[model samples]
Target chain A: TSSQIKHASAVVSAPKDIAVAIGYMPEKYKAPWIIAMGVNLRAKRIIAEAEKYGVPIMRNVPLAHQLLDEGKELKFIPETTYEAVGEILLYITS
Target chain B: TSSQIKHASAVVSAPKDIAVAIGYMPEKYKAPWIIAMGVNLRAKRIIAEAEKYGVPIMRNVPLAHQLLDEGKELKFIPETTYEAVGEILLYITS
Candidate 1:
């Protein structure tokens, strides 16, 4: 059910910072790349798009802030964040 | 001279990670955004393009590593890196 899926997914965003969307593609990527990122309305759109596609969302404001600080489109996760993002990936996939 | 301009620009890239191109636009931004970012050949192209435009290049492996870990396209820098990136911006514009 849509509501059930929504309850299961996580959504990460903050008022003062940009929002980010992360997904795992183990066969093609070492770490998750930020699928999307933006502020305000654009941020809302990313969340909507994720929901539409049934992509799980995770809301960690500080992590989102840090990831946005460290990642670019089509870029891999940095070493420092390996443990942190890795845990999230495990949670989402498992 | 091309060399003179080349010598002035700052380029930041690293192996085993991604490359980032940063530019300041005070009129439109609160912090510098990653204009372009990628790995390998694409990273080289960013530096070349910046040089062609006479943009100052800065090579700081650790800082580049850190920034790439933190920033995305059209996104303002995090408060944590304000001082470091601020100095670079000051150097470039001054």
Candidate 2:
């Protein structure tokens, strides 16, 4: 059932666009880290996983590009992005 | 002189935070791409490079994390980010 939900979310994105998934743990980590990302299929999977787990998904190409440049599996986020991410965290927690 | 300016800008960031650089070309490319990103010294270099070229630097941690998940050296950005990226382009071009 979980995987099925993920599968359903993955099918919603466009074929050509990039998909990015972020994981934030306020108590454990200082900033949100990108858990997964890719084009089409890969993006779909990431989205599916997020949806399955109830992670909030927010789309912003500029932000995505900015984080993608940091490479994958990073430990923390850049300081410049703090405000935006903070807002997202606020929404997620509240 | 150009490198010097870059160096100066690079030093302005917090040593612990991530730094991301984005490159946008409206006519040549469909979406903005992540040019470079890293922590401390590496991030400094990216900012320096962008400053050297007069590329706009926006600081958004959430967006940065999204892009970082997409991997490096991508050709285009995710469609979800189009609206935000478009606004940045408008400011840049105007």
Candidate 3:
């Protein structure tokens, strides 16, 4: 009996809402980055709920911004899915 | 959000019941080989219920014995825990 929730699905869904909630750079809007690590689905629900009342989910939004704003380049792991990458970047903006 | 179930714990418990159900060699009994693969704990309940009607959970107990019988030795990775590994071996024998 798998849980009804899916991790990758939730990660992909995050950016769509984040984009709507906090306007991101037009160029980067379609390409959010995914964090390699993830909290389990239960923790994810708490994060989603906290979002309703303005809780911050990302560990370090400003750190993410430093890389993006300063044009510091980095590479994603081969195992990292594009949707997951997109969500990571979107998390920073939000 | 994540579910409350823990995967490692369940895997460790698998062997105890298995050994009780099916008697294995005394030498192999304590040193039960662990299979690295696991399903969600939620799925485990279904297997437990099927046991009531004598449904076999492991894909092939005979196949597992072939591995043990032939002494086709293998090494456990550093990440494996003793108890956890014990439980996995028990799963196959069960």
| TM-score per candidate | 0.41, 0.39, 0.17
Tens-place lDDT per residue, model 2, B1-94, is 2233332211112222655455565567666765555665776666556545544454344555655555364346556555654554454345
Off by over 4 Å in 3: A1-94, B1-24, B28-30, B35-37, B53-79, B83-94
TM-score of 3: 0.17
Candidate maximizing TM-score: 1
Q: Which ten contiguous residues of candidate 1 chain A have the minimum total lDDT?
A: A1-10
Q: What digit string (tens of lDDT, one per residue) describes model 3 on residues A16-54?
A: 122111122345544332222223463345345434443
Worst 10 residues of 2 chain A by lDDT: A7-16
Of all true interface contacts, what fraction is found in model 3?
0.00
**Tens digit per residue, CA lDDT, model 2, A43-89:** 66665575455444544445556655654643455566556556545
User: Which parts of model 1 are misplaced by more than 4 Å?
Assistant: A1-11, A15-17, B1-94
- For model 3, the DockQ equals 0.01
Rank the models by lDDT, top first: 1, 2, 3
> TM-score of A-chain in each prediction?
0.74, 0.65, 0.22
- Highest lDDT: give the candidate number: 1
Sorted into a CAPRI-style docking class, model 1 comes out as incorrect
**Tens-digit lDDT string for candidate 3 (B7-79):** 1122221221221112224454444332323234533443344334332232222233333333221233223
Which of the predicted structures, 2 or 3, would earn the higher lDDT when compared with the native?
2
